[PDB]
Every structure is written in structure tokens, then in C-alpha cells.
Design a protein around this ligand. Structure first.
Ligand SMILES: [Mg+2]
Ligand SMILES: [Mg+2]
Ligand SMILES: [Mg+2]
Ligand SMILES: [Mg+2]
Ligand SMILES: [Mg+2]
Ligand SMILES: [Mg+2]
Ligand SMILES: [Mg+2]
Ligand SMILES: [Mg+2]
Ligand SMILES: [Mg+2]
Ligand SMILES: [Mg+2]
Ligand SMILES: [Mg+2]
Ligand SMILES: [Mg+2]
Ligand SMILES: [Mg+2]
Ligand SMILES: [Mg+2]
Ligand SMILES: [Mg+2]
Ligand SMILES: [Mg+2]
Ligand SMILES: [Mg+2]
Ligand SMILES: [Mg+2]
Ligand SMILES: [Mg+2]
Ligand SMILES: [Mg+2]
Ligand SMILES: [Mg+2]
Ligand SMILES: [Mg+2]
Ligand SMILES: [Mg+2]
Ligand SMILES: [Zn+2]
Lengths: 99, 82, 126, 155, 116, 60
RNA sequence: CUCAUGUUGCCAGCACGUUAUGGUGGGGACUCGUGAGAGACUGCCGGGGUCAACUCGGAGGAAGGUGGGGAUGACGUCAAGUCAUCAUGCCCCUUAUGUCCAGGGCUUCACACAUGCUACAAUGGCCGGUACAAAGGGCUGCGAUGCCGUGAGGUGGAGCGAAUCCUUUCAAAGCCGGUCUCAGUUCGGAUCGGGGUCUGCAACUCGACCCCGUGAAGUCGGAGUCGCUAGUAAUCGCAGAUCAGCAACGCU
């Protein structure tokens, strides 16, 4: 029994959902068992900046850095499935780490 | 206070100058541009001219002030009162 | 199997009802041992006191998150809801008493530039 | 308060005895928001008063509040460049609340070296009529009946 | 009681009676009482002469107190004021030596307030 | 920021202790966040222009 | 609230642990985390209303009359702040007011003002036992167990680009037991001396932390003046931004 942790980690909800959908379709066509895009807590990075230089600091605002990560545990890593995952071309908005 | 493991810190150029002075036995006033140099027993009878930013002020060192930095005895600010 | 969940100010609780005796099982210890507060015991027993079916249900509780009062209130709501589930005939008296209405208040967002919650920094005209 | 009378909270009753006056007392004496500390101190002082007096704590508290609750007060008013005081009747609810306030105020500022016993002793003194609270009530009534003359303003 | 010319309190715990000695403080008193094995809650009425004598011997053997400490502090003061050190100048001017905010703080050292 | 000072900072210092950020373009040595490599106003302007893929206003 | 959903997350119902806890085989029956939809629209009834807006009360409901808090600054005023962010017109230096480095400074004080913590003691100081949360940071960084230090920390280094390994089982207040009987106090801790650890080539002006001695002012405060109308006011904690070392009681 071997499992491959396909890590999906992107910024945009639309982008991550689309990449996950493409992965599910590819796996289903190739004939391998995948649990699916198991939701994971989204890391939150908040940064505070002042309005303008030279004082006027009482009023502030925050910027977040959205990071959505999904878990894809694929069972039965078929050679054809791994090759297809290598050859799949994904948008720059999604980076896949295989471990 | 400086840690004992690291030990006292002495600038190499001033160490060379004082070594030459004490080896030749000549005692003169040496222009000192270092404020971070600690005192060593070898400075017992050496005169150093420390720079306060305005003019090199000579200072005479004796055994009494062992364990203290050179800049401690050279005032940097003038305060005449009010 | 009867199941229920109660939440209040981030106090999620679990309760499982059993027509056996009136035993209180809070994470393996009795109610008196867990959170020994008279106000707590009173509010936890308020629903069964209102329904007048004391010493007839056994409850096992699993608690995660929240504070003492939050967990106690969530457990009260959970047992009330489980009682309604097993017997909805007490609906009109229990809703009039207010046991089946959840408490929709929790920690609220607090402003940038304010100390916390609703706090305000010292505001002097000098 | 410009729009109108605001709603009043539904204050809870004390389950230990059965009188909301205990809840009011603990809330008034709340210092730095330590509810358990305040209630335990209040209960201890109540038991101390009970064992000191040999009577019912609820009955003696009722006697004290009845004795100390005023019925007339004084309000400040300035008209025509001169300051004056007018007496105005007070609702019994506010009278009881202010009586509790004075009870706390005079349970704060005496030198018995231990406030847990001292609050009980102050309660006994107020019940007996030798208390600083009853002295303050005497003074307030004296002021009101002295300023009775300016009652024509009616505000 | 009395010890090294110091009149101990009429009624007070030994951990503070020894503290009142110039050369001994709170944690030092705790340490000496722990070493001697004497409990720290007893009052000043329960002491015994032999314990006082042995304590005096121990403290004089392993520490210097009162006059010796004062005179050696003053010796440090005069040597630092004579060597022309920054601490000596600060002592001359009557100010803390660490270089705190003398603009507003150091009121304790400069003493009362005088209005110009 | 003076160009000579910027160039000197970019040069390799003789001691490792002499390393500091000096926000890239505007050369502001203060109010700079390490990961971004840009100062407060630089971050404000670039984020408002939307030039960085992922920063956005805050409302939660 | 309904549907989809089971790992590094939880356990309804079954088996293995036998002191270490779902730890392990198993399982969506609920939270758990992230996708879709419904739900507040005066929805309905009675009275006032010009039969209209609008208003009071009542039933259902989680919410009743913009549920709560947010993102969200119409034309303009204050020649308001910012050539020390950046760019920009004009004058000025060019052999200097440019440029590299050694030491010093921005931390100086006979005083004043503004913002914060410590208090001014028993609702308490101190000692022993003892249960309850959130979220985020971690690559030239967090740092396990073990060993030596009172403690700063010293050796070592499992687990980690991270629901997994560390930030202690995230605690403080809270509850029980003991001393203090009101003292310039066992409250309170600044100032001044004697010993060490840590980062840095470089701790005297000029950092921070640990141990000791030192024991000052201060007993609720003057006219005046400030914030606060529900999870509100008060009180007690945790993490992060800048950062090798910190001025961290400030800010988020
Ligand atoms: Mg201001
Ligand atoms: Mg630097
Ligand atoms: Mg900068
Ligand atoms: Mg399970
Ligand atoms: Mg306008
Ligand atoms: Mg202008
Ligand atoms: Mg102008
Ligand atoms: Mg120009
Ligand atoms: Mg220009
Ligand atoms: Mg020019
Ligand atoms: Mg020039
Ligand atoms: Mg230079
Ligand atoms: Mg400065
Ligand atoms: Mg504080
Ligand atoms: Mg050790
Ligand atoms: Mg703990
Ligand atoms: Mg102290
Ligand atoms: Mg002290
Ligand atoms: Mg302290
Ligand atoms: Mg005082
Ligand atoms: Mg006092
Ligand atoms: Mg006043
Ligand atoms: Mg730093
Ligand atoms: Zn910049």
C-alpha cells in the first residue's frame, strides 16, 4: 500500500477549485482512487500599514494574504497516473508538490 | 561587562604600538584614535593621547585604573552649569 | 441513537440521552466534580426541572473549546434539544420558558485603532 | 435618553435565599469585576452578621433597608444667576438603590481593620439606628425640610 | 534581640530581623535561614542566645556587614571620583550613573524640587 | 535616498553586521517588511495598483 | 438549517491496547475544516391613520420592524501635512554643501507638559495542591527527550517549508489549604554596590537577562478635566509586525 500526497496550494478559491476539478477528472479517467479535495484550514496573514507618511497614523487598515491549501491523498499510484500528472499542464496560479 | 570567555579586547595596531614602545623602553605620548581599547597591566607607565572629537587629550595611566576603558576618563561633553 | 450539539461563544458540546438513571457524565466525571459551581449546576438542571422528568435520563458529554460558562450553557441547550427530539410534546412550554432558543451572541470583531472589542483610546481635546 | 425611556434589564433573583436584594448588593459591591470573590465575601459577611445578631439575616436586612430608605431628596438648580436647591419626591425603587449605594459607601470608609466583619457590623449599626447610613439619611431629610421653601419651582 | 550592634525588632519574624541588618536582605535572609534550618515564620519572642551566637559567627565568617560595607562603598566612591572616571564625574554632579532619562527622571537623586 | 549611499549599501560590507534592507527603489531604510522587500508606501501603492498577485483589502 | 463530505481531523455501534491518550483495525451517525442552497420581506392579524405613507401591540420564527459589527469619506473649507518616500519647475555647490573611512552625538538637564505600567494594601502580598480557549510564526529558523545550572542559560538535538514537530497537555484570573490583624507594612519597588549568561570583530558614553546587598517618595489626591449605554464598562492573559542583541509598559 503506497499513497502519494499531492499538495495543492494556491491563492484564489476559483483557481484552486479549478485545479482540483482538473485533477479529479484526470484521476477518474486514468482509473485511480482519490479521496478528493479534503478542505484544510486556510493560513491567514494580516499586515497593517499606515495611511500616509509624516504622521496621520490614527486611522489604519489591514491587508490579508489568502492562501488556500487542499489535501489529495491518491491511493494505488499507477505508473500511467503518475505520468499523466507529470504531463498535465496547469495554470501558473497553481503549484503542485509531489511527496 | 565583556564576557570572560571572550576575554579583554585590544586593537591590534595599538597593541603593536605599545609593544614596540615598552620593548624599546621609550615613553612618549601616543595619538590614540581608539575608544574601545581596554586597559592592560602593560599600560602601567604609558601615556596615551585619546581623541574626544576636538583634540587629542593626553592621559597618564597608572595601576589604579586597571579594569576600565580608555574613554571613561576622557569627558565627551562640556557642562559648565547654569 | 439520539444525538445533539450545542454551541455558544465557541463552546461545542456533545450529549447522548439514555432513559436510565439521572447520572451526569461530563468527560468521565460527575457534574459536581466538573465545574463545581452552584450557578452551573442550577442552569444545567433547569431544563429537566422545567420538564419535571428528573432522575430519568443519563447523559454523556464531550466538550471542546469555549469557557466554563460557555460549555455549561451549551450543554444546557444540548440536553434541552435532545429532550425535545425524544419528545416534541413539550414544545410549547419549553419554547415559552426559553430553553430551546439559542443565545446568538459571542465575541465580536474589534476595530483597528481600538484597544479591544469596543474600547476607545483616551480622547482629549488638549 | 432623548428618544424616550430605555428598556430595563430583567435582573435575576438570588437562588441561595430567594431575594434579588442579594444580587443587587453583590453587583453594587463588585470591585474589578470579580463575581465569585464578591459573592463569597457577601455570603461570609452575611453569615457573620447572622451569628452576631442571632436573628434572620433576610429579616434584619429588610429592617435595615426599611429604616434607611429615604423618601425625599434635593436637586440643584440655578436661576437668574443664582444657585438654588429644590426638593423632589423619589420613586421607592430609586430610593432603595441609593440606600444600597450609601450602605456600600459607608461600608468602605471605617477603620475596623477587617471589612468582612466590618460590613456585618455596619449592617447591625444601620438596623439599630446608630449607623452612618442613618446619620446621612437624617442629614438629607434635614436639608430637604430646610429647603422646603423653594419647592415652588417644581422641577 | 541584638546582633552586631543592631537592635532586632521587639516582635517580628527573623527573616526580617536579619534583613534589617545592613549587609543582609530578603532573599539573603531566606538563604541563611534555609542553611541554618530555622523556620522562617517564628516571632521575635522565640529566639535563643546560642542560635544568635552561631548565626553571628557564620555571617561574620562568610560575609561583611554594616560598617565594613559602608566604608568599602565609600572607598569605591573616592577612588572613582579621583581617577576621573565617568562614574566619578556623575558622582561629582550628583546623578545616577547608568544614564537614565535625567531630563525628567532622577528626581529621587536630585532630591526636592527647586523653582527658578 | 542618495544614489551613492544606495550603491555603497548594495556593495559587500567588510562586516556581516553592516547588512540592512534599504527598500529597493525608493531607498527608504525604515519601515520595510522583510518578506516583501518593500516599504510601507511602496506596498500601499503596488497593492492598490494590484501589481502583486494575492494582496487585497481586509474586511472580516 | 439542508445537501456533498472522512485525513494529519472526530467517534455513534463493534475488536486489539493494558497504562499514554482513537493509540491501533474500523465508521458520517453530529461538530470538526471549505463548496451549494434556504431563511426577514411589516411575512400575517387588531387599533390609529386623508385608505397613504408611517406607528403601537399580538402569533410563527434564530432573529421584527436598517439582527450585530465591518469594507464603503457627495461638492467644498482649513494656501492643513508631506521637495526627508518618489518624481517634478527655478536658484544655489562642482574642485564643493559630492564622495570612503577612524572616534563622538542624536540617550545631554537647575525645570515644565502629554500618553502608558507599578501601586498607594486584606476584594490583598506570599507558599502548596488544582480545571477551564482563540488564533497565528517557524530554513540558514522553531527547537523534543536527556544531563548541569536558583536562572539567565551551557551540551545535545527527534519532528518540521509545517490540522502532523515546537510555540509547554496554550495558560492567567478561578477553587481548596496555611501566615500576615493593618505597620510606611511579609504591600510597594526605583536609586546606588558586589558576582554571571546570552547576540555581536567591536557593551565606558550606550543594549537586554539572572543572583545578592541597598531600602527613598508615595495612605485615593486642589480647582480643572477625560472614556464608557451590552458581552457594554472594569480586571487578567496569549500570539505577531520591525529584529542576531534590545530602548517593547507602545502598535496590531
Ligand atoms: Mg493628541
Ligand atoms: Mg543593518
Ligand atoms: Mg525602510
Ligand atoms: Mg472515528
Ligand atoms: Mg467635501
Ligand atoms: Mg498651501
Ligand atoms: Mg502654506
Ligand atoms: Mg532639487
Ligand atoms: Mg524640482
Ligand atoms: Mg546646488
Ligand atoms: Mg557637497
Ligand atoms: Mg564614515
Ligand atoms: Mg533622537
Ligand atoms: Mg503593568
Ligand atoms: Mg543548568
Ligand atoms: Mg500548565
Ligand atoms: Mg524591591
Ligand atoms: Mg526594593
Ligand atoms: Mg513585582
Ligand atoms: Mg508617601
Ligand atoms: Mg500608607
Ligand atoms: Mg474639581
Ligand atoms: Mg529586534
Ligand atoms: Zn519603498
Amino acid at each position: 500500500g503506497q499513497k502519494i500526497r499531492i499538495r495543492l496550494k494556491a491563492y484564489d478559491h476559483e483557481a484552486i477549485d479549478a485545479s482540483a476539478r482538473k485533477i479529479v477528472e484526470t484521476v477518474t479517467r486514468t482509473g485511480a482512487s482519490v479521496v478528493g479535495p479534503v478542505p484544510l484550514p486556510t493560513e491567514k496573514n494580516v499586515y497593517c500599514v499606515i495611511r500616509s507618511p509624516h504622521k496621520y497614523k490614527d486611522s489604519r487598515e489591514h491587508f490579508e494574504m489568502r492562501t488556500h491549501k487542499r489535501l489529495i491523498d491518491i491511493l494505488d499510484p499507477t505508473p500511467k497516473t503518475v505520468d499523466a500528472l507529470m504531463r498535465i499542464d496547469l495554470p501558473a496560479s497553481v503549484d503542485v508538490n509531489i511527496q | 561587562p565583556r564576557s570572560l570567555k571572550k576575554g579583554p579586547f585590544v586593537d591590534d595596531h595599538l597593541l603593536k604600538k605599545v609593544d614596540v614602545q615598552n620593548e624599546k623602553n621609550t615613553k612618549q605620548v601616543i595619538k590614540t584614535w581608539s575608544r574601545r581599547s581596554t586597559i592592560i597591566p602593560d599600560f602601567i607607565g604609558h601615556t596615551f593621547a585619546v581623541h574626544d572629537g576636538r583634540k587629542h587629550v593626553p592621559v597618564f595611566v597608572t595601576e589604579a585604573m586597571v579594569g576600565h576603558k580608555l574613554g571613561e576618563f576622557a569627558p565627551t561633553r562640556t557642562f559648565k552649569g547654569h | 441513537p439520539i444525538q445533539t450539539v450545542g454551541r455558544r461563544k465557541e463552546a461545542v458540546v456533545r450529549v447522548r440521552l439514555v432513559p436510565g438513571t439521572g447520572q451526569f457524565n461530563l468527560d468521565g466525571r460527575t457534574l459536581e466534580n466538573y465545574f463545581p459551581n452552584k450557578v452551573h449546576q442550577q442552569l444545567i438542571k433547569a431544563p429537566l426541572v422545567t420538564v419535571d422528568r428528573v432522575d430519568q435520563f443519563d447523559i454523556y458529554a464531550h466538550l471542546d473549546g469555549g469557557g466554563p460558562s460557555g460549555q455549561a450553557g451549551a450543554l444546557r441547550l444540548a440536553i434541552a434539544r435532545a429532550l425535545i427530539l425524544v419528545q416534541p410534546e413539550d414544545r410549547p412550554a419549553l419554547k415559552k420558558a426559553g430553553f430551546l432558543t439559542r443565545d446568538p451572541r459571542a465575541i465580536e470583531r474589534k476595530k483597528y485603532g481600538l484597544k479591544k472589542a469596543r474600547k476607545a483610546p483616551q480622547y482629549s481635546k488638549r | 435618553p432623548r428618544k424616550g425611556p430605555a428598556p430595563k434589564r430583567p435582573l435575576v433573583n438570588d437562588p441561595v435565599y430567594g431575594s434579588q436584594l442579594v444580587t443587587q448588593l453583590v453587583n453594587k459591591v463588585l470591585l474589578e469585576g470579580k463575581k465569585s470573590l464578591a459573592e463569597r465575601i457577601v455570603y461570609g459577611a452575611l453569615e457573620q452578621a447572622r451569628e452576631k445578631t442571632g436573628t434572620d439575616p433576610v429579616v434584619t436586612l429588610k429592617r435595615a433597608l426599611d429604616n434607611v430608605k429615604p423618601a425625599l431628596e434635593v436637586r440643584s438648580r440655578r436661576v437668574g444667576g443664582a444657585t438654588y436647591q429644590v426638593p423632589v419626591e423619589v420613586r421607592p425603587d430609586r430610593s432603595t438603590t441609593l440606600a444600597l449605594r450609601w450602605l456600600v459607601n459607608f461600608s468602605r470608609q471605617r477603620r475596623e481593620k477587617t471589612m468582612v466583619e466590618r460590613l456585618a457590623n455596619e449592617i447591625l449599626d444601620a438596623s439599630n439606628g446608630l449607623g452612618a447610613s442613618v446619620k446621612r439619611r437624617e442629614d438629607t431629610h434635614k436639608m430637604a425640610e430646610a429647603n422646603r421653601a423653594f419647592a415652588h419651582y417644581r422641577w | 534581640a541584638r546582633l552586631v550592634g543592631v537592635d532586632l525588632p521587639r516582635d517580628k519574624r527573623m527573616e526580617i530581623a536579619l534583613t534589617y541588618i545592613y549587609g543582609i536582605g530578603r532573599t539573603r535572609s531566606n538563604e541563611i535561614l534555609a542553611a541554618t534550618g530555622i523556620d522562617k515564620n517564628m516571632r521575635t519572642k522565640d529566639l535563643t542566645d546560642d542560635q544568635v551566637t552561631v548565626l553571628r559567627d557564620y555571617i561574620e565568617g562568610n560575609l561583611k556587614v554594616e560598617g565594613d560595607l559602608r566604608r568599602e562603598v565609600q572607598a569605591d566612591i573616592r577612588r572613582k571620583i579621583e581617577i576621573g572616571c565617568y562614574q566619578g564625574l556623575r558622582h561629582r554632579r550628583g546623578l545616577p550613573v547608568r544614564g537614565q532619562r535625567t531630563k525628567t527622571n532622577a528626581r529621587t537623586r536630585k532630591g526636592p524640587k527647586r523653582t527658578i | 535616498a542618495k544614489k551613492a549611499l544606495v550603491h555603497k549599501a548594495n556593495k559587500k560590507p567588510k562586516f556581516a553586521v553592516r547588512a540592512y534592507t534599504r527598500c529597493n527603489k525608493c531607498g527608504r531604510p525604515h519601515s520595510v517588511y522583510r518578506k516583501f522587500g518593500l516599504c510601507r508606501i511602496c506596498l500601499r501603492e503596488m497593492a492598490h495598483a494590484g501589481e502583486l498577485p494575492g494582496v487585497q483589502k481586509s474586511s472580516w
